[PDB]
């Protein structure tokens, strides 16, 4: 993805302040609460019947950490998202059977979580840069689908 | 909102379909799988090879459900109740996928109804599929 | 369908927006133009720079409409009938854009309500915005 | 886009059978009838009150021939769609103010027209090849939006 120096700067600056563990768990949790159909991939995670159950589920927080961690690594290769996520793309298609539409929903929830967490610091321009980034990541993860 | 005229159009086109509802239903799925491969993520357990009994059988279930909807065009929520539950709580198919199958059913009808697929009918059928899609995704959350 | 809990959630959250409704509507528009540049194609007659009084004025109108929607949560189609007519027949904004504005409204709300923007409340507002989008696109065809 | 040689030939073979002016008028008319909001750019075209009015309108036909002629010429540069449509991309954004969603709607209507026109010859595989082409053209026309 092509980001202007300004968009790149914005992205990196904010990311330095993110507690990947915490933010990862919140983002995955909100995905499961706001778009309940996404729970279809987590049957073995236990109790997901209520918002409090989802948010406080250790398997959810654990997975969230994992996902945002991989996401994190992607920020370091904004110039080559496809090549960076090719292996995971294939895994998600071939082994996990995940509809890439889910990457898009996660992207939007992440933006909501960033806004919630950072408040006024998540300005319109910053949002716009993250929107390009989450779009990019989603595309990269869907690239090896067949 | 399906106008009176829409309903008339849909009933006329579907009648035409008649006995091929099953065959048409299989072809629409096959067109989906090929055109939009991400939809295959919902059928990992299926034999998706051209002309598989699985696809033929499923195409017939899909066609029957649509016939039911035309029959009960005025009471769709009621008519498709069990199916919306299935899709929403059991299958949990992302709603975006409904547009893809709808487009594929529209292409299948166009390919098979040369006399009937006029611009007016095409509009009514598109609205009908959107309406069915709306019902099927209304209990998701 | 908005549950009794969803209605309660939406009234609490909108209640807290209070007098800031208009500023938030402006911010949401600005977030939309920046993040989804294609939405600018509907406002070629507007000065879209940051701080634009036109954007602010328009944001206040949008916010006021949402206020009216919350006040009439069980009678939305009637309360928003003129707006549905307007968007459907005069403005003719492609339906796809409604999800974009909804998202930017969610983002704005999250940035302003640290306390109230709970997972539960987030789901209720998402549902509420989809319900409003539904009403506004109901007369398109 | 990237089409396999088999797909490129499938697209090419069928296109040689298309009356570009006829299909053009038909695709544009059908766009205006099935998604009436698309009529917003053609208020100067005259009577668009009913489906018959739309389909028989000489300006709709004229415009349809224009759009599909461009599309047609485009099929000779499948290897370079972005480059082929860059200037047109810019025009549609800067001067015409056309939501790129319209390109996607037209692409789908074109696919329905081809199916209606060709019946059984428009097989699933051929459809898939056209789908990649219409998504390619729509992407190319949207590329320069800002
Ligand atoms: C026009 C919209 C649709 C209609 C009318 C429809 C209809 C049906 C019917 C009648 C069944 C069989 C239920 C039974 O056996 O009791 C079914 C099952 C199913 N549908 Fe749909 N469906 C639609 C959209 C979708 C979409 C868009 C997808 C995914 C892309 C999907 C995926 C499935 C799956 C995975 C099953 C279960 C198949 C199995 O395991 O046998 N459906 N649907
Ligand atoms: C939550 C959904 C929406 C709400 C509540 C809403 C509300 C409104 C209101 C209250 C007005 C002013 C009506 C008047 O002049 O009496 C308006 C006008 C307008 N809306 Fe929306 N709208 C929504 C979605 C959209 C979207 C998604 C777009 C395009 C991306 C859009 C584009 C416009 C335009 C272009 C105007 C006319 C502005 C002018 O030139 O004065 N609306 N809308």
Curated annotation (Swiss-Prot), chains A, D:
Effect seen on changing residue 94 to H: In Barcelona; O(2) affinity up
Binding, heme b: 63, 92
Mutagenesis or variant effect for residue 112 to F: In Canterbury
Effect the entry attributes to changing residue 104 to T: In Sherwood Forest
Residues modified to N-pyruvate 2-iminyl-valine: 1
Effect the entry attributes to changing residue 94 to N: In Bunbury; O(2) affinity up
Effect on the protein upon substituting residue 121 to G: In St Francis
Consequence of changing residue 42 to L: In Louisville; unstable
Effect the entry attributes to changing residue 126 to E: In Hofu; unstable
Outcome recorded upon mutating residue 23 to F: In Palmerston North; O(2) affinity up; unstable
Modified residues (N-acetylvaline): 1
Site (Not glycated): 59, 82, 95
Record annotation: effect of changing residue 94 to G: In Chandigarh
Phenotype upon changing residue 90 to K: In Agenogi; O(2) affinity down
Annotated effect of mutating residue 21 to G: In Connecticut; O(2) affinity down
Effect on the protein upon substituting residue 36 to S: In North Chicago; O(2) affinity up
PROSITE patterns recorded: GLOBIN
Residues binding (2R)-2,3-bisphosphoglycerate, per UniProt: 1-2, 82, 143
Effect of residue 121 to V: In D-Camperdown/Beograd
Effect of substituting residue 101 to Q: In Rush; unstable
Effect of substituting residue 115 to D: In B-THAL; Hradec Kralove; unstable
Outcome following mutation: residue 52 to H: In Summer Hill
Additional notes on this entry: One molecule of 2,3-bisphosphoglycerate can bind to two beta chains per hemoglobin tetramer.
Protein name, as recorded: Hemoglobin subunit beta
Organism whose genome encodes this protein: Homo sapiens
Swiss-Prot record, chains B, C:
Location of Phosphotyrosine modifications: 24
Mutagenesis / variant outcome for changing residue 34 to R: In Queens/Ogi
Mutagenesis / variant outcome for changing residue 21 to P: In Fontainebleau
Mutagenesis or variant effect for residue 19 to E: In J-Tashikuergan
Modification type N6-acetyllysine: residues: 16
Effect caused by changing residue 1 to E: In Thionville; O(2) affinity down
Outcome of mutating residue 24 to H: In Luxembourg; unstable
Positions annotated to bind heme b: 87
Domain named Globin: residues: 1-141
Record PTM Phosphothreonine, positions in chain: 8, 108, 134, 137
Annotated effect of mutating residue 13 to P: In Ravenscourt Park; causes alpha-thalassemia
Xref: Gene3D superfamilies: Globins
Positions where N6-succinyllysine occurs in the chain: 7, 11, 16, 40
Result when mutating residue 45 to R: In Fort de France; O(2) affinity up
Known outcome of mutating residue 62 to M: In Evans; unstable
Keywords: Acetylation, Disease variant, Glycation, Glycoprotein, Heme, Hereditary hemolytic anemia, Iron, Metal-binding, Oxygen transport, Phosphoprotein, Transport
Substitution effect: residue 63 to D: In Pontoise; unstable
Effect on the protein upon substituting residue 59 to V: In Tottori; unstable
Effect of residue 95 to A: In Denmark Hill; O(2) affinity up
Clinical note on disease: Heinz body anemias: Form of non-spherocytic hemolytic anemia of Dacie type 1. After splenectomy, which has little benefit, basophilic inclusions called Heinz bodies are demonstrable in the erythrocytes. Before splenectomy, diffuse or punctate basophilia may be evident. Most of these cases are probably instances of hemoglobinopathy. The hemoglobin demonstrates heat lability. Heinz bodies are observed also with the Ivemark syndrome (asplenia with cardiovascular anomalies) and with glutathione peroxidase deficiency.
Family per record: Belongs to the globin family.
Protein name from the UniProt record: Hemoglobin subunit alpha
Gene source species: Homo sapiens
